[PDB]
């Protein structure tokens, strides 16, 4: 019910709870997230988009940032019209149902007033702090580059020119946000979403890793990717199919099971599901076939809307 | 003599010797230097301006850069209207005889096309490279700031957007210029002028430490400032008064001396003067007063034009 807990849902960290409550009292508020344009949109993008719609529905005006520059800066893509990728990216977010104010990076990040504050910011940032903020975002080049330390201050100075009271992002962005809370004049609050494990089970879910499900993928592809996933019995930590169960699932839900071995088991909470998978009452194969079907149902509207 | 040797004169290093010749053969040609604007213009600035005039005499169109932006980036000053300070510096350089295209930094270091190339350059520059190039130009901060690593690329990028075939500066700016030779497509020629030691002798000449002789200093000060200089008999290295004779005074010179100790002696070259000090044949009080009197003469026209 309460808009606080609706926002706090599935959020690993909120800095801070109290500070959020004070700016909830304000009449007009803004929340902002930024995405580097990626070819295929995966589930980790959806989870963040969910929380923006939660803030949007809570009265927030939403700013979504497309970091077309950081593609060159972080060597993500040496393509000119990456905006074309971001166009589709912008379209996919609208298909999910988030009407926001999409601000491309190249529009606002070469202005003289902004570039000045970037140097002003570099006057207060130390080399050690900047590298520390990029331990989970950068590429960790053997011969590191000057662009690595420019990425955080541009990230921090962007938050300023967007003036968003709420700054959202993955847990990867925790350190740049703490740096931004230190240097920026206004103390924006930070909402950090959990990092999804991949279907490989070894690393985080990223498109380049290939361990990703796409809202654009075909129903049979979702069946196959899940069928091969790292779903171990008695494992809830590091289990990606259990992560899908925690976030993108709707309760109650019916799991088909013949009565000889148990019976149709309707679950009403992930904590119920977590207790049954941990004590080995539910088999991974059964969990995979169940989680797959709802995901196909949930991503199907977003699919046809494209 | 020839425009080469006039340009080589009193230069520590020229990268490259063969390249400068090819630049001189080109009819149209440009050379550029840059200065962080300071309140008082000491002798160390005059030496750099001289070599621009030597480049200007050879036909090089000259560009002087005023690093108004780097007044904050290196924390040289937090004052806003540094322009008025640098505007006084403009006329000061003209009195020395240098008419040039003065380009303020802030008027171009914030453009869209310039800023973008800074990032594109940061995608080819490593952190260790920029940190080493800043060794002689740093503030020796305990916790280094990101602005220290940003500074050299802006220089390397400023050199590009000025397209100056000849990039000239102090010997401390060597590594920044060696970075521009590696990164920039046009291999600009580098001319490195020596570093003048300060009157204290322990440090170098800077407007901060106060061990400087300004071109607007009053004639009695030049005598008193030189009177308390580190002039060690028999040492030419690290001798500031010796360096004044090497780069600024004109020859031949006759030092006044009673006959009993050798009489008035005629020195026709700094090498002869350098030989006498090593051979103890010349006392510092003599060399001090002699160097001072010749200096006020040289600084007299520049000093008068500033007045009124
Ligand atoms: N680091 C991300 C990419 C990224 C790049 C720039 C960026 O700053 C812009 C911004 C910042 C805070 C609030 C709102 C906005 N905004 O412009 O809407 C945000 C994200 C990644 O690793 O994907
Ligand atoms: N480093 C100096 C100050 C300094 C600042 C900027 C600078 O680059 C600009 C430039 C460079 C070469 C040719 C032309 C131009 N230009 O843009 O006119 C050069 C020197 C000091 O520490 O005193």
Structure tokens that stand for B87 in this block: 């505007």
DSSP state letters, A156-180: HHHHHHHT-SEEEEEGGGHHHHHHH
Residue with tokens 């580059």: A145
Which own/partner contact pairs does B296-303 have at CB distance under 8 Å and 24+ positions apart? B296/B219, B296/B222, B296/B223, B298/B248, B298/B249, B298/B250, B299/B215, B299/B217, B299/B222, B301/B95, B302/B92, B302/B95, B302/B96, B302/B215, B303/B215, B303/B216
- Give the CA angle between residues A278, A279, A285 to the nearest 5°: 70
Q: Is the CB of residue B33 less than 8 Å from the CB of residue B48?
A: yes
Q: What is the CATH number of the domain that holds A232?
A: 1.10.240.10
Cβ count within 10 A of residue B21: 12
Burial class (CB in 10 A: 0-12, 13-18, 19+), B82: buried
Q: Is the CB of residue A183 less than 8 Å from the CB of residue A121?
A: yes
Beta strand pairing status for B189-193 and B13-15?
antiparallel
State the Cα–Cα distance between residues B249 and A242, nearest whole angstrom: 84
For ligand 1, what atom is nearest to the CA of residue A137? Answer: 22
Task: Give the domain extent around B229.
Answer: 219-306
B204 lies in some domain:
no
Residue B18 and residue B96 share a domain: yes
Residue A130 and residue A232 share a domain: no
State the Cα–Cα distance between residues B159 and B114, nearest whole angstrom: 11
Structure tokens that stand for A123 in this block: 């006057």
Which of A69, A75, A149 lies at the smallest CB-CB distance from B146? A149
Q: What is the CATH number of the domain that holds A27?
A: 3.40.50.620
List the strands of the sheet with B189-193, edge to edge.
Answer: B13-15, B189-193, B166-170, B30-35, B61-66, B101-104
Asked if the Cβ–Cβ distance from A144 to B130 is below 8 Å, we say no
Burial class (CB in 10 A: 0-12, 13-18, 19+), B177: buried
This PDB structure is determined at a resolution in Å of 2.8
Residue B226 and residue B188 share a domain: no
Residue A80 and residue A175 share a domain: yes
Q: Which helix (H) or strand (E) element contains residue A4? A: helix A3-8
Structure tokens that stand for A292 in this block: 């797959």
Q: Whose CA is nearest to atom 12 of ligand 1?
A: A159
State the Cα–Cα distance between residues B115 and B120, nearest whole angstrom: 9
Q: Tell me the three state secondary structure of residue B163.
A: coil
Q: Is the CB of residue B64 less than 8 Å from the CB of residue B49?
A: no
Residue B183 and residue B46 share a domain: yes
What chain A residue is nearest to B149 in terms of C-alpha separation?
A146
B214 lies in some domain:
no
Residue B47 and residue B11 share a domain: yes
Which of A75, A110, A126 lies at the smallest CB-CB distance from B115? A110
Radius of gyration of chain B (CA): 21
Q: Is the CB of A63 under 6 A from ligand 1?
A: yes
How many domains does chain B contain in total? 2
């Amino acid at each position: 019910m309460d808009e606080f807990e609706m926002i706090k849902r599935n959020t690993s960290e909120i800095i801070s709870e109290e500070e959020l409550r004070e700016v909830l009292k304000k009449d007009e508020k803004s929340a902002g997230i930024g995405f580097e344009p990626s070819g295929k949109i995966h589930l980790g993008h959806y989870l963040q988009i969910k929380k923006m719609i939660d803030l949007q529905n809570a009265g927030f005006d939403i700013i979504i940032g497309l970091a077309d520059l950081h593609a060159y800066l972080n060597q993500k893509g040496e393509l000119d019209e990456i905006r074309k990728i971001g166009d589709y990216n912008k379209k996919v977010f609208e298909a999910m149902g988030l009407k926001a104010k999409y601000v491309y990076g190249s529009e606002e990040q070469l202005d003289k007033d902004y570039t000045l504050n970037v140097y002003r910011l570099a006057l207060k940032t130390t080399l050690k702090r900047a590298r520390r903020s990029m331990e989970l975002i950068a590429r960790e080049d053997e011969n590191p580059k000057v662009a690595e330390v420019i990425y955080p201050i541009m990230q921090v100075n962007s938050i300023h020119y967007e003036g968003v009271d709420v700054a959202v992002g993955g847990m990867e962005q925790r350190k740049i946000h703490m740096l931004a809370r230190e240097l920026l004049p206004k103390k924006v609050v930070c909402i950090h979403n959990p990092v999804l494990t991949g279907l490989d089970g070894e690393g985080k879910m990223s498109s380049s890793k290939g361990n990703f499900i796409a809202v654009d993928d075909s129903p049979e592809e979702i069946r196959a990717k899940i069928k091969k996933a790292y779903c171990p019995a008695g494992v809830v930590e590091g289990n990606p199919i259990m992560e899908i169960a925690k976030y993108f699932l709707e309760y109650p839900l019916t799991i088909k099971r013949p009565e000889k071995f148990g019976g149709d088991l309707t679950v009403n909470s992930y904590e119920e599901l977590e207790s049954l998978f941990k004590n080995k009452e539910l088999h991974p194969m059964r969990l995979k076939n169940a989680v797959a079907e709802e995901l196909i149902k949930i991503l199907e509207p977003i699919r046809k809307r494209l």
